[PDB]
Amino acid sequence: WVIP
Amino acid sequence: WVIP
Amino acid sequence: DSCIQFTRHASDVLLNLNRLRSRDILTDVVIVVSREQFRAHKTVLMACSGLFYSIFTDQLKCNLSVINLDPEINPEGFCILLDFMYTSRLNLREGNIMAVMATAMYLQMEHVVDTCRKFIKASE
Amino acid sequence: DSCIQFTRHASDVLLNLNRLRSRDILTDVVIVVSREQFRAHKTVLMACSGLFYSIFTDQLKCNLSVINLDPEINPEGFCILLDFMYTSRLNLREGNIMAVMATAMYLQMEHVVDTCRKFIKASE
Ligand SMILES: O=C1Cc2cc(Nc3nc(Cl)ncc3F)ccc2N1
Numbered sequence: 001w002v003i004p
Numbered sequence: 005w006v007i008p
Numbered sequence: 009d010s011c012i013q014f015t016r017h018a019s020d021v022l023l024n025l026n027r028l029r030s031r032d033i034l035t036d037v038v039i040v041v042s043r044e045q046f047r048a049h050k051t052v053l054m055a056c057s058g059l060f061y062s063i064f065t066d067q068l069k070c071n072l073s074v075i076n077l078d079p080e081i082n083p084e085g086f087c088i089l090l091d092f093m094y095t096s097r098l099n100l101r102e103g104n105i106m107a108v109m110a111t112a113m114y115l116q117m118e119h120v121v122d123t124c125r126k127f128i129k130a131s132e
Numbered sequence: 133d134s135c136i137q138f139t140r141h142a143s144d145v146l147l148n149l150n151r152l153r154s155r156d157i158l159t160d161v162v163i164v165v166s167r168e169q170f171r172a173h174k175t176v177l178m179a180c181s182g183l184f185y186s187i188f189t190d191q192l193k194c195n196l197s198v199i200n201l202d203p204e205i206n207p208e209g210f211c212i213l214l215d216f217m218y219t220s221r222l223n224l225r226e227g228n229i230m231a232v233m234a235t236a237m238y239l240q241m242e243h244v245v246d247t248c249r250k251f252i253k254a255s256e
């Protein structure tokens with residue numbers, strides 16, 4: 001999961 | 005396009 | 009093999025599937041979550057959810073155009089997860105995390121359940 | 133928004149759509165390319181091809197379960213492109229590049245047409  |  | 013691969017292909021496919029959903033093109037099922045209705049593509053639901061995979065591979069249920077979910081399921085939680093299925097983006101907030109996690113457990117979306125558990129653990 | 137994003141989601145969705153295709157699950161159209169038949173999902177075809185997008189958004193054609201392509205289309209070229217749609221990988225070889233490029237122009241798959249043009253230019 002990432003900060004888009 | 006890339007070499008997978 | 010000796011194939012070449014277009015990096016952005018899968019993302020571009022998903023973006024177009026979400027555009028078809030927006031425009032109600034070739035949607036073939038309505039998911040009912042108490043008083044709310046959500047239109048979607050059976051194939052996208054099966055590709056994202058262990059529960060929908062089991063439902064639409066069943067010889068009788070594969071033919072249904074309406075699926076009613078358990079009354080304990082929160083429509084906002086379902087809406088957030090449906091948007092995730094079509095976009096890869098999860099709108100996880102302090103005010104919805106418990107409903108999202110409960111919905112993801114019911115829908116059998118293991119990666120979502122994993123990030124919810126981690127965000128909850130960080131708050132404790 | 134304040135969303136989080138699961139990087140591998142779109143790739144995992146496409147992999148599952150290809151598994152449904154393999155297992156002939158919820159395929160809803162047959163594409164005929166002379167003597168050959170290819171089963172697929174209308175939504176995936178529309179998401180990848182400008183030609184299929186135009187066909188399945190047409191009020192009469194959206195209901196067809198069989199689509200016949202132009203007799204000049206090569207079945208191997210179509211097969212290579214159908215595999216690309218479901219996997220992001222293009223099996224481009226000296227022996228098939230002309231048929232693949234001609235098929236991609238007909239199907240309106242601009243990124244494929246672009247890589248074929250570049251590989252042809254490099255050989256000249
Ligand atoms: O957490 C999850 C997400 C998820 C999706 C699927 N989907 C499919 N699985 C296979 Cl093997 N082939 C085709 C499919 F559409 C099954 C189980 C699970 N569990």
Ligand SMILES: O=C1Cc2cc(Nc3nc(Cl)ncc3F)ccc2N1
Nearest residue numbers: 024027178179180181182240241242
């Ligand atoms: O080279 C290409 C690939 C391609 C795909 C599509 N697909 C869709 N386009 C839109 Cl805007 N919404 C939903 C779709 F399924 C249209 C044109 C083109 N041209």
Ligand SMILES: [Cl-]
Nearest residue numbers: 117118119120
């Ligand atoms: Cl997931």
Ligand SMILES: [Cl-]
Nearest residue numbers: 241242243244
């Ligand atoms: Cl393309």
